[PDB]
Amino acid sequence: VTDHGPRPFVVNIEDETKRNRAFRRALWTGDHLQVTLMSIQVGEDIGLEIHPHLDQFLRVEEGRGLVQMGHRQDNLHFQEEVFDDYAILIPAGTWHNVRNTGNRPLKLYSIYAPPQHPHGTVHETKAIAMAA
Amino acid sequence: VTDHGPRPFVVNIEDETKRNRAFRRALWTGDHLQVTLMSIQVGEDIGLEIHPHLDQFLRVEEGRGLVQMGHRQDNLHFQEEVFDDYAILIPAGTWHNVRNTGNRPLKLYSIYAPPQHPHGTVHETKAIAMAA
């Protein structure tokens, strides 16, 4: 998996998402949307964030997690479990986090609109992402 | 399934996509991205289109199809089969069609960025969509 954006592209997304081991790997960066793959370690979270300029779609391909969202950083009153087959919609301006609560890495893909990361972004680990 | 945009939202996307029977049903319309569900009948196609202002992501949840894409309407030189588990990336300015080539309805979801359809759009059939 390298970043194939902005090419017309067909991919087995189930398989690439499950095979990916990086915290974040850009798969396709276009002018208007970006697809990244994420593998989140047991006990780990993406990290609380807010994106006022973009919407995000996440799809869980494997594992179990906890999604936390709110209007304000100090009140994440939306708290829902997510599992294999689930999608999460994160509208612009909503504070959010996703925590792995299961017993294996949590495998998901993320679609940002508009794009968030540089073309070809790879953060192998959470620590690397945080530093970036 | 009604359109839940722009709410923070978690959904079993595999199940909603497979259960949906409409040619197009908006599931979530935000400010920056929109998710629709599509059930495409045996022998039917979405219809050749071009969206110069938006990128589209499609994920096939069930069935088999043929994706056709090109730079020019009269030369769709990208021709690839798609199956369950496959995603299709359609960058802005690429002419595209998706045809059902299998033996049951082709079930997919589509993410447009920015949004394409009014909030709460339902086109039960292709004919209705074409008329719209």
Side-chain angles (χ1 to χ4, degrees), chain A residues 1-18 20 22-63 65-123 125-132, chain B residues 1-18 20 22-63 65-123 125-132:
Chain A
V1 166
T2 59
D3 185 335
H4 287 72
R7 295 280 66 74
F9 180 56
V10 166
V11 64
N12 185 333
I13 195 66
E14 182 264 9
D15 193 55
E16 298 301 337
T17 299
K18 288 172 185 182
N20 167 64
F23 179 79
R24 182 179 286 121
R25 182 181 303 283
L27 177 63
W28 194 93
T29 306
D31 277 347
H32 308 284
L33 75 78
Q34 171 173 63
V35 184
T36 66
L37 307 180
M38 303 187 82
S39 181
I40 303 144
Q41 302 308 305
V42 172
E44 173 177 272
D45 65 337
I46 297 175
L48 183 61
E49 195 45 276
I50 181 169
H51 290 119
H53 294 290
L54 60 81
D55 287 346
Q56 189 176 357
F57 170 97
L58 292 84
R59 209 273 200 197
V60 178
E61 286 287 349
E62 184 167 276
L66 179 63
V67 173
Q68 306 174 307
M69 292 193 268
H71 200 212
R72 284 185 57 89
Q73 188 187 352
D74 61 7
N75 188 10
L76 306 176
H77 50 77
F78 182 102
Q79 302 258 326
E80 299 292 345
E81 292 195 279
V82 295
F83 308 102
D84 328 69
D85 295 341
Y86 283 50
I88 310 163
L89 278 297
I90 309 180
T94 286
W95 288 89
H96 55 280
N97 199 0
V98 177
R99 305 181 172 279
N100 186 353
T101 60
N103 73 355
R104 55 172 59 129
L106 172 67
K107 308 291 193 164
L108 59 86
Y109 61 89
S110 161
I111 297 172
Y112 296 92
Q116 173 61 5
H117 302 284
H119 190 281
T121 290
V122 181
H123 299 142
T125 67
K126 187 183 189 181
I128 289 161
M130 289 315 87
Chain B
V1 166
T2 59
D3 185 335
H4 287 72
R7 295 280 66 74
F9 180 56
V10 166
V11 64
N12 185 333
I13 195 66
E14 182 264 9
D15 193 55
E16 298 301 337
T17 299
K18 288 172 185 182
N20 167 64
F23 179 79
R24 182 179 286 121
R25 182 181 303 283
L27 177 63
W28 194 93
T29 306
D31 277 347
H32 308 284
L33 75 78
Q34 171 173 63
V35 184
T36 66
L37 307 180
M38 303 187 82
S39 181
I40 303 144
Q41 302 308 305
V42 172
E44 173 177 272
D45 65 337
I46 297 175
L48 183 61
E49 195 45 276
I50 181 169
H51 290 119
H53 294 290
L54 60 81
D55 287 346
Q56 189 176 357
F57 170 97
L58 292 84
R59 209 273 200 197
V60 178
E61 286 287 349
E62 184 167 276
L66 179 63
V67 173
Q68 306 174 307
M69 292 193 268
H71 200 212
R72 284 185 57 89
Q73 188 187 352
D74 61 7
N75 188 10
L76 306 176
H77 50 77
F78 182 102
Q79 302 258 326
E80 299 292 345
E81 292 195 279
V82 295
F83 308 102
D84 328 69
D85 295 341
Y86 283 50
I88 310 163
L89 278 297
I90 309 180
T94 286
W95 288 89
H96 55 280
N97 199 0
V98 177
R99 305 181 172 279
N100 186 353
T101 60
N103 73 355
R104 55 172 59 129
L106 172 67
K107 308 291 193 164
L108 59 86
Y109 61 89
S110 161
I111 297 172
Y112 296 92
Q116 173 61 5
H117 302 284
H119 190 281
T121 290
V122 181
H123 299 142
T125 67
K126 187 183 189 181
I128 289 161
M130 289 315 87

PDB file of all heavy atoms in Angstrom, chain A residues 92-111:
ATOM      1  N   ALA A  92     -17.822  17.900  11.295  1.00  0.00           N
ATOM      2  CA  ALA A  92     -16.941  19.022  11.606  1.00  0.00           C
ATOM      3  C   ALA A  92     -17.420  19.727  12.871  1.00  0.00           C
ATOM      4  O   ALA A  92     -18.599  20.035  13.018  1.00  0.00           O
ATOM      5  CB  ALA A  92     -16.937  19.999  10.436  1.00  0.00           C
ATOM      6  N   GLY A  93     -16.469  20.075  13.737  1.00  0.00           N
ATOM      7  CA  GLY A  93     -16.757  20.756  14.975  1.00  0.00           C
ATOM      8  C   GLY A  93     -17.134  19.938  16.187  1.00  0.00           C
ATOM      9  O   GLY A  93     -17.403  20.476  17.253  1.00  0.00           O
ATOM     10  N   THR A  94     -17.139  18.613  16.030  1.00  0.00           N
ATOM     11  CA  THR A  94     -17.402  17.688  17.115  1.00  0.00           C
ATOM     12  C   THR A  94     -16.039  17.145  17.643  1.00  0.00           C
ATOM     13  O   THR A  94     -15.170  16.698  16.872  1.00  0.00           O
ATOM     14  CB  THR A  94     -18.398  16.570  16.646  1.00  0.00           C
ATOM     15  OG1 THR A  94     -19.748  17.098  16.535  1.00  0.00           O
ATOM     16  CG2 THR A  94     -18.488  15.481  17.693  1.00  0.00           C
ATOM     17  N   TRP A  95     -15.809  17.279  18.955  1.00  0.00           N
ATOM     18  CA  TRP A  95     -14.649  16.706  19.611  1.00  0.00           C
ATOM     19  C   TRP A  95     -14.864  15.178  19.604  1.00  0.00           C
ATOM     20  O   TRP A  95     -15.987  14.707  19.828  1.00  0.00           O
ATOM     21  CB  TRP A  95     -14.569  17.172  21.059  1.00  0.00           C
ATOM     22  CG  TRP A  95     -14.171  18.594  21.204  1.00  0.00           C
ATOM     23  CD1 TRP A  95     -15.002  19.684  21.235  1.00  0.00           C
ATOM     24  CD2 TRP A  95     -12.842  19.086  21.317  1.00  0.00           C
ATOM     25  NE1 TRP A  95     -14.257  20.827  21.376  1.00  0.00           N
ATOM     26  CE2 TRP A  95     -12.931  20.497  21.460  1.00  0.00           C
ATOM     27  CE3 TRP A  95     -11.580  18.484  21.366  1.00  0.00           C
ATOM     28  CZ2 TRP A  95     -11.806  21.304  21.601  1.00  0.00           C
ATOM     29  CZ3 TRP A  95     -10.463  19.298  21.520  1.00  0.00           C
ATOM     30  CH2 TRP A  95     -10.586  20.690  21.641  1.00  0.00           C
ATOM     31  N   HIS A  96     -13.800  14.416  19.333  1.00  0.00           N
ATOM     32  CA  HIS A  96     -13.961  12.969  19.217  1.00  0.00           C
ATOM     33  C   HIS A  96     -12.694  12.217  19.626  1.00  0.00           C
ATOM     34  O   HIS A  96     -11.572  12.699  19.483  1.00  0.00           O
ATOM     35  CB  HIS A  96     -14.322  12.640  17.777  1.00  0.00           C
ATOM     36  CG  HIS A  96     -13.331  13.181  16.791  1.00  0.00           C
ATOM     37  ND1 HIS A  96     -13.341  14.499  16.376  1.00  0.00           N
ATOM     38  CD2 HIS A  96     -12.266  12.604  16.195  1.00  0.00           C
ATOM     39  CE1 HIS A  96     -12.353  14.690  15.518  1.00  0.00           C
ATOM     40  NE2 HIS A  96     -11.682  13.559  15.393  1.00  0.00           N
ATOM     41  N   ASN A  97     -12.913  10.988  20.071  1.00  0.00           N
ATOM     42  CA  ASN A  97     -11.813  10.046  20.302  1.00  0.00           C
ATOM     43  C   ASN A  97     -12.365   8.660  19.993  1.00  0.00           C
ATOM     44  O   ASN A  97     -13.572   8.445  20.064  1.00  0.00           O
ATOM     45  CB  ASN A  97     -11.291  10.128  21.736  1.00  0.00           C
ATOM     46  CG  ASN A  97      -9.906   9.539  21.900  1.00  0.00           C
ATOM     47  OD1 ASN A  97      -9.305   9.053  20.955  1.00  0.00           O
ATOM     48  ND2 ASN A  97      -9.389   9.597  23.137  1.00  0.00           N
ATOM     49  N   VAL A  98     -11.456   7.732  19.642  1.00  0.00           N
ATOM     50  CA  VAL A  98     -11.820   6.328  19.452  1.00  0.00           C
ATOM     51  C   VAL A  98     -10.742   5.542  20.209  1.00  0.00           C
ATOM     52  O   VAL A  98      -9.539   5.724  19.973  1.00  0.00           O
ATOM     53  CB  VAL A  98     -11.835   5.889  17.974  1.00  0.00           C
ATOM     54  CG1 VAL A  98     -12.164   4.377  17.876  1.00  0.00           C
ATOM     55  CG2 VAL A  98     -12.830   6.705  17.169  1.00  0.00           C
ATOM     56  N   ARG A  99     -11.195   4.718  21.131  1.00  0.00           N
ATOM     57  CA  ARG A  99     -10.311   3.917  21.976  1.00  0.00           C
ATOM     58  C   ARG A  99     -10.485   2.431  21.631  1.00  0.00           C
ATOM     59  O   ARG A  99     -11.613   1.947  21.545  1.00  0.00           O
ATOM     60  CB  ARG A  99     -10.679   4.115  23.459  1.00  0.00           C
ATOM     61  CG  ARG A  99     -10.684   5.582  23.939  1.00  0.00           C
ATOM     62  CD  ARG A  99     -11.027   5.761  25.436  1.00  0.00           C
ATOM     63  NE  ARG A  99     -10.846   7.135  25.880  1.00  0.00           N
ATOM     64  CZ  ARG A  99      -9.673   7.681  26.208  1.00  0.00           C
ATOM     65  NH1 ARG A  99      -8.560   6.969  26.175  1.00  0.00           N
ATOM     66  NH2 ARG A  99      -9.620   8.951  26.617  1.00  0.00           N
ATOM     67  N   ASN A 100      -9.369   1.712  21.537  1.00  0.00           N
ATOM     68  CA  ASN A 100      -9.446   0.267  21.362  1.00  0.00           C
ATOM     69  C   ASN A 100      -9.814  -0.361  22.710  1.00  0.00           C
ATOM     70  O   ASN A 100      -9.036  -0.280  23.646  1.00  0.00           O
ATOM     71  CB  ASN A 100      -8.125  -0.267  20.836  1.00  0.00           C
ATOM     72  CG  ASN A 100      -8.203  -1.743  20.509  1.00  0.00           C
ATOM     73  OD1 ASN A 100      -9.214  -2.385  20.796  1.00  0.00           O
ATOM     74  ND2 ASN A 100      -7.110  -2.292  19.964  1.00  0.00           N
ATOM     75  N   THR A 101     -10.942  -1.055  22.783  1.00  0.00           N
ATOM     76  CA  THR A 101     -11.337  -1.714  24.040  1.00  0.00           C
ATOM     77  C   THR A 101     -11.282  -3.226  23.937  1.00  0.00           C
ATOM     78  O   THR A 101     -11.689  -3.923  24.902  1.00  0.00           O
ATOM     79  CB  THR A 101     -12.816  -1.333  24.411  1.00  0.00           C
ATOM     80  OG1 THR A 101     -13.697  -1.763  23.368  1.00  0.00           O
ATOM     81  CG2 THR A 101     -12.932   0.111  24.621  1.00  0.00           C
ATOM     82  N   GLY A 102     -10.823  -3.745  22.796  1.00  0.00           N
ATOM     83  CA  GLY A 102     -10.803  -5.184  22.560  1.00  0.00           C
ATOM     84  C   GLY A 102      -9.442  -5.777  22.834  1.00  0.00           C
ATOM     85  O   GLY A 102      -8.568  -5.138  23.436  1.00  0.00           O
ATOM     86  N   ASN A 103      -9.303  -7.036  22.402  1.00  0.00           N
ATOM     87  CA  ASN A 103      -8.170  -7.852  22.737  1.00  0.00           C
ATOM     88  C   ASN A 103      -7.207  -8.108  21.586  1.00  0.00           C
ATOM     89  O   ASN A 103      -6.317  -8.971  21.685  1.00  0.00           O
ATOM     90  CB  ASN A 103      -8.673  -9.212  23.310  1.00  0.00           C
ATOM     91  CG  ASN A 103      -9.291 -10.173  22.219  1.00  0.00           C
ATOM     92  OD1 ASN A 103      -9.453  -9.835  21.043  1.00  0.00           O
ATOM     93  ND2 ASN A 103      -9.629 -11.395  22.652  1.00  0.00           N
ATOM     94  N   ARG A 104      -7.353  -7.346  20.511  1.00  0.00           N
ATOM     95  CA  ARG A 104      -6.457  -7.397  19.363  1.00  0.00           C
ATOM     96  C   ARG A 104      -6.452  -5.988  18.784  1.00  0.00           C
ATOM     97  O   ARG A 104      -7.318  -5.155  19.139  1.00  0.00           O
ATOM     98  CB  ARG A 104      -6.951  -8.420  18.308  1.00  0.00           C
ATOM     99  CG  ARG A 104      -8.383  -8.196  17.833  1.00  0.00           C
ATOM    100  CD  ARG A 104      -8.782  -9.103  16.639  1.00  0.00           C
ATOM    101  NE  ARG A 104      -8.638 -10.512  17.000  1.00  0.00           N
ATOM    102  CZ  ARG A 104      -9.580 -11.437  16.844  1.00  0.00           C
ATOM    103  NH1 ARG A 104     -10.762 -11.137  16.289  1.00  0.00           N
ATOM    104  NH2 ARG A 104      -9.313 -12.663  17.182  1.00  0.00           N
ATOM    105  N   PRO A 105      -5.504  -5.684  17.893  1.00  0.00           N
ATOM    106  CA  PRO A 105      -5.521  -4.364  17.251  1.00  0.00           C
ATOM    107  C   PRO A 105      -6.840  -4.047  16.558  1.00  0.00           C
ATOM    108  O   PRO A 105      -7.492  -4.942  15.984  1.00  0.00           O
ATOM    109  CB  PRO A 105      -4.374  -4.477  16.260  1.00  0.00           C
ATOM    110  CG  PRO A 105      -3.420  -5.416  16.882  1.00  0.00           C
ATOM    111  CD  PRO A 105      -4.307  -6.448  17.514  1.00  0.00           C
ATOM    112  N   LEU A 106      -7.232  -2.791  16.659  1.00  0.00           N
ATOM    113  CA  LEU A 106      -8.460  -2.308  16.076  1.00  0.00           C
ATOM    114  C   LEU A 106      -8.097  -1.791  14.679  1.00  0.00           C
ATOM    115  O   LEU A 106      -7.237  -0.907  14.545  1.00  0.00           O
ATOM    116  CB  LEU A 106      -9.021  -1.205  16.932  1.00  0.00           C
ATOM    117  CG  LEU A 106     -10.220  -0.410  16.423  1.00  0.00           C
ATOM    118  CD1 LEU A 106     -11.479  -1.255  16.326  1.00  0.00           C
ATOM    119  CD2 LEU A 106     -10.460   0.798  17.349  1.00  0.00           C
ATOM    120  N   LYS A 107      -8.724  -2.362  13.637  1.00  0.00           N
ATOM    121  CA  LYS A 107      -8.413  -2.080  12.242  1.00  0.00           C
ATOM    122  C   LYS A 107      -9.558  -1.274  11.634  1.00  0.00           C
ATOM    123  O   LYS A 107     -10.703  -1.734  11.610  1.00  0.00           O
ATOM    124  CB  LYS A 107      -8.249  -3.374  11.438  1.00  0.00           C
ATOM    125  CG  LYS A 107      -7.253  -4.386  12.046  1.00  0.00           C
ATOM    126  CD  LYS A 107      -5.812  -3.873  11.946  1.00  0.00           C
ATOM    127  CE  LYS A 107      -4.840  -4.987  12.245  1.00  0.00           C
ATOM    128  NZ  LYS A 107      -3.478  -4.721  11.837  1.00  0.00           N
ATOM    129  N   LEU A 108      -9.237  -0.069  11.202  1.00  0.00           N
ATOM    130  CA  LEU A 108     -10.273   0.748  10.564  1.00  0.00           C
ATOM    131  C   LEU A 108      -9.690   1.530   9.400  1.00  0.00           C
ATOM    132  O   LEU A 108      -8.473   1.674   9.266  1.00  0.00           O
ATOM    133  CB  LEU A 108     -10.958   1.653  11.545  1.00  0.00           C
ATOM    134  CG  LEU A 108     -10.069   2.625  12.270  1.00  0.00           C
ATOM    135  CD1 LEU A 108      -9.907   3.873  11.437  1.00  0.00           C
ATOM    136  CD2 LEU A 108     -10.661   3.037  13.661  1.00  0.00           C
ATOM    137  N   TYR A 109     -10.588   2.009   8.545  1.00  0.00           N
ATOM    138  CA  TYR A 109     -10.216   3.066   7.621  1.00  0.00           C
ATOM    139  C   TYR A 109     -10.990   4.319   7.882  1.00  0.00           C
ATOM    140  O   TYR A 109     -12.104   4.282   8.415  1.00  0.00           O
ATOM    141  CB  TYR A 109     -10.336   2.638   6.161  1.00  0.00           C
ATOM    142  CG  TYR A 109     -11.694   2.208   5.589  1.00  0.00           C
ATOM    143  CD1 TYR A 109     -12.601   3.156   4.997  1.00  0.00           C
ATOM    144  CD2 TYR A 109     -12.068   0.882   5.558  1.00  0.00           C
ATOM    145  CE1 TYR A 109     -13.775   2.700   4.447  1.00  0.00           C
ATOM    146  CE2 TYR A 109     -13.228   0.455   5.003  1.00  0.00           C
ATOM    147  CZ  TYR A 109     -14.105   1.399   4.444  1.00  0.00           C
ATOM    148  OH  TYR A 109     -15.256   0.839   3.914  1.00  0.00           O
ATOM    149  N   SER A 110     -10.354   5.435   7.515  1.00  0.00           N
ATOM    150  CA  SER A 110     -10.873   6.751   7.766  1.00  0.00           C
ATOM    151  C   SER A 110     -10.935   7.524   6.450  1.00  0.00           C
ATOM    152  O   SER A 110     -10.011   7.422   5.614  1.00  0.00           O
ATOM    153  CB  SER A 110      -9.997   7.446   8.798  1.00  0.00           C
ATOM    154  OG  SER A 110     -10.165   8.843   8.783  1.00  0.00           O
ATOM    155  N   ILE A 111     -12.021   8.245   6.241  1.00  0.00           N
ATOM    156  CA  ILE A 111     -12.180   9.120   5.073  1.00  0.00           C
ATOM    157  C   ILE A 111     -12.347  10.522   5.645  1.00  0.00           C
ATOM    158  O   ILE A 111     -13.287  10.773   6.429  1.00  0.00           O
ATOM    159  CB  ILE A 111     -13.353   8.728   4.202  1.00  0.00           C
ATOM    160  CG1 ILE A 111     -13.074   7.303   3.644  1.00  0.00           C
ATOM    161  CG2 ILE A 111     -13.587   9.774   3.151  1.00  0.00           C
ATOM    162  CD1 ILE A 111     -14.203   6.715   2.939  1.00  0.00           C
TER     163      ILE A 111
END
